[PDB]
């Protein structure tokens, strides 16, 4: 029973960079984050990751355990944001905008340590949404630890934070 639960939108790139080495795109972090929400009963989970991350590990952009991305895609959970090469240069659509817009329109939660304040300054309704619906986190090795107080001490509990009740 997970439609008393708010839909969950995970910043795949943020979580990947947060987990393990802070200089490595660690896809296990994405799996661990998703698994944490799955074990609680969530059924509406979307992970946004730029499409160019499917490319093999380059020295500029290191990445581990790539197979998880496609696996999560086949499981309907992960969605790739558009990206392509024009005239020898990589063009990337702002995945952060996908994250914010989807979560806002689905009336859900954003899982990220990124504040997205450029987008917040762009649209007032987005700023208010982010202020009230951003779930930050911390990684202790393979342990995914979100705070019981997402909005501080006067905010709701983590349990009630994820419910539409
Ligand atoms: Mg980002
Ligand atoms: Na990382």
PDB file of N, CA, C and O in Angstrom, residues 5 9 17 19 28 38 41 47 59 65 90 94 96 101 105 113 137 140 148 151 154 158:
ATOM      1  N   UNK A   5       1.548   7.289   0.294  1.00  0.00           N
ATOM      2  CA  UNK A   5       2.928   7.723   0.191  1.00  0.00           C
ATOM      3  C   UNK A   5       3.116   8.676  -0.977  1.00  0.00           C
ATOM      4  O   UNK A   5       2.569   8.464  -2.057  1.00  0.00           O
ATOM      5  N   UNK A   9      11.186  11.306  -6.230  1.00  0.00           N
ATOM      6  CA  UNK A   9      12.067  11.625  -7.349  1.00  0.00           C
ATOM      7  C   UNK A   9      13.508  11.779  -6.872  1.00  0.00           C
ATOM      8  O   UNK A   9      13.824  12.684  -6.100  1.00  0.00           O
ATOM      9  N   UNK A  17      27.348  10.724  -6.868  1.00  0.00           N
ATOM     10  CA  UNK A  17      28.551  11.463  -6.502  1.00  0.00           C
ATOM     11  C   UNK A  17      28.747  11.498  -4.989  1.00  0.00           C
ATOM     12  O   UNK A  17      29.873  11.594  -4.499  1.00  0.00           O
ATOM     13  N   UNK A  19      27.776   9.041  -2.798  1.00  0.00           N
ATOM     14  CA  UNK A  19      28.178   7.716  -2.336  1.00  0.00           C
ATOM     15  C   UNK A  19      29.599   7.357  -2.760  1.00  0.00           C
ATOM     16  O   UNK A  19      30.038   7.707  -3.855  1.00  0.00           O
ATOM     17  N   UNK A  28      26.040   2.361  -7.259  1.00  0.00           N
ATOM     18  CA  UNK A  28      25.555   1.582  -6.124  1.00  0.00           C
ATOM     19  C   UNK A  28      24.786   2.472  -5.155  1.00  0.00           C
ATOM     20  O   UNK A  28      23.830   2.028  -4.519  1.00  0.00           O
ATOM     21  N   UNK A  38      12.158   1.405  -1.359  1.00  0.00           N
ATOM     22  CA  UNK A  38      11.409   0.205  -1.719  1.00  0.00           C
ATOM     23  C   UNK A  38      11.048  -0.622  -0.490  1.00  0.00           C
ATOM     24  O   UNK A  38       9.931  -1.126  -0.381  1.00  0.00           O
ATOM     25  N   UNK A  41       7.904   0.536   1.264  1.00  0.00           N
ATOM     26  CA  UNK A  41       6.612   0.333   0.633  1.00  0.00           C
ATOM     27  C   UNK A  41       6.320   1.258  -0.534  1.00  0.00           C
ATOM     28  O   UNK A  41       5.263   1.157  -1.156  1.00  0.00           O
ATOM     29  N   UNK A  47      14.148   7.803 -10.918  1.00  0.00           N
ATOM     30  CA  UNK A  47      15.524   8.281 -10.858  1.00  0.00           C
ATOM     31  C   UNK A  47      15.945   8.923 -12.176  1.00  0.00           C
ATOM     32  O   UNK A  47      15.873   8.294 -13.230  1.00  0.00           O
ATOM     33  N   UNK A  59      38.561   9.072 -18.035  1.00  0.00           N
ATOM     34  CA  UNK A  59      39.354   9.629 -16.931  1.00  0.00           C
ATOM     35  C   UNK A  59      38.768  10.916 -16.351  1.00  0.00           C
ATOM     36  O   UNK A  59      38.927  11.176 -15.160  1.00  0.00           O
ATOM     37  N   UNK A  65      30.120   0.305 -11.656  1.00  0.00           N
ATOM     38  CA  UNK A  65      28.918  -0.527 -11.658  1.00  0.00           C
ATOM     39  C   UNK A  65      27.807   0.080 -12.507  1.00  0.00           C
ATOM     40  O   UNK A  65      26.721   0.385 -12.016  1.00  0.00           O
ATOM     41  N   UNK A  90      29.589  17.899 -26.494  1.00  0.00           N
ATOM     42  CA  UNK A  90      28.474  17.310 -25.770  1.00  0.00           C
ATOM     43  C   UNK A  90      27.463  18.358 -25.315  1.00  0.00           C
ATOM     44  O   UNK A  90      27.822  19.350 -24.680  1.00  0.00           O
ATOM     45  N   UNK A  94      19.331  20.062 -18.908  1.00  0.00           N
ATOM     46  CA  UNK A  94      19.490  20.178 -17.462  1.00  0.00           C
ATOM     47  C   UNK A  94      18.613  19.162 -16.721  1.00  0.00           C
ATOM     48  O   UNK A  94      17.399  19.336 -16.596  1.00  0.00           O
ATOM     49  N   UNK A  96      18.461  18.522 -13.693  1.00  0.00           N
ATOM     50  CA  UNK A  96      17.905  19.114 -12.481  1.00  0.00           C
ATOM     51  C   UNK A  96      16.502  19.659 -12.733  1.00  0.00           C
ATOM     52  O   UNK A  96      15.632  19.593 -11.864  1.00  0.00           O
ATOM     53  N   UNK A 101      10.714  19.598 -11.941  1.00  0.00           N
ATOM     54  CA  UNK A 101       9.415  19.657 -12.604  1.00  0.00           C
ATOM     55  C   UNK A 101       8.565  18.414 -12.343  1.00  0.00           C
ATOM     56  O   UNK A 101       7.380  18.527 -12.031  1.00  0.00           O
ATOM     57  N   UNK A 105       5.088  18.524 -10.153  1.00  0.00           N
ATOM     58  CA  UNK A 105       3.822  18.222 -10.813  1.00  0.00           C
ATOM     59  C   UNK A 105       3.175  16.947 -10.279  1.00  0.00           C
ATOM     60  O   UNK A 105       1.953  16.805 -10.310  1.00  0.00           O
ATOM     61  N   UNK A 113      20.951  16.414  -2.217  1.00  0.00           N
ATOM     62  CA  UNK A 113      21.617  17.374  -1.351  1.00  0.00           C
ATOM     63  C   UNK A 113      21.806  18.695  -2.082  1.00  0.00           C
ATOM     64  O   UNK A 113      22.324  19.662  -1.523  1.00  0.00           O
ATOM     65  N   UNK A 137      20.261  13.925   2.633  1.00  0.00           N
ATOM     66  CA  UNK A 137      20.716  12.622   3.099  1.00  0.00           C
ATOM     67  C   UNK A 137      22.199  12.609   3.448  1.00  0.00           C
ATOM     68  O   UNK A 137      22.923  13.570   3.188  1.00  0.00           O
ATOM     69  N   UNK A 140      26.896   6.721   5.066  1.00  0.00           N
ATOM     70  CA  UNK A 140      27.919   6.077   5.877  1.00  0.00           C
ATOM     71  C   UNK A 140      28.240   4.738   5.223  1.00  0.00           C
ATOM     72  O   UNK A 140      27.551   3.745   5.461  1.00  0.00           O
ATOM     73  N   UNK A 148      15.635  12.264  10.228  1.00  0.00           N
ATOM     74  CA  UNK A 148      14.281  12.154  10.757  1.00  0.00           C
ATOM     75  C   UNK A 148      13.611  13.523  10.810  1.00  0.00           C
ATOM     76  O   UNK A 148      12.397  13.623  10.974  1.00  0.00           O
ATOM     77  N   UNK A 151      12.964  19.033   7.645  1.00  0.00           N
ATOM     78  CA  UNK A 151      12.753  20.482   7.643  1.00  0.00           C
ATOM     79  C   UNK A 151      13.173  21.113   8.967  1.00  0.00           C
ATOM     80  O   UNK A 151      12.721  22.205   9.317  1.00  0.00           O
ATOM     81  N   UNK A 154      11.256  21.851  13.870  1.00  0.00           N
ATOM     82  CA  UNK A 154       9.845  22.222  13.798  1.00  0.00           C
ATOM     83  C   UNK A 154       9.159  21.709  12.539  1.00  0.00           C
ATOM     84  O   UNK A 154       8.005  22.038  12.275  1.00  0.00           O
ATOM     85  N   UNK A 158      10.268  12.211   9.507  1.00  0.00           N
ATOM     86  CA  UNK A 158      10.570  11.622   8.209  1.00  0.00           C
ATOM     87  C   UNK A 158       9.433  10.719   7.739  1.00  0.00           C
ATOM     88  O   UNK A 158       9.114  10.678   6.551  1.00  0.00           O
TER      89      UNK A 158
END
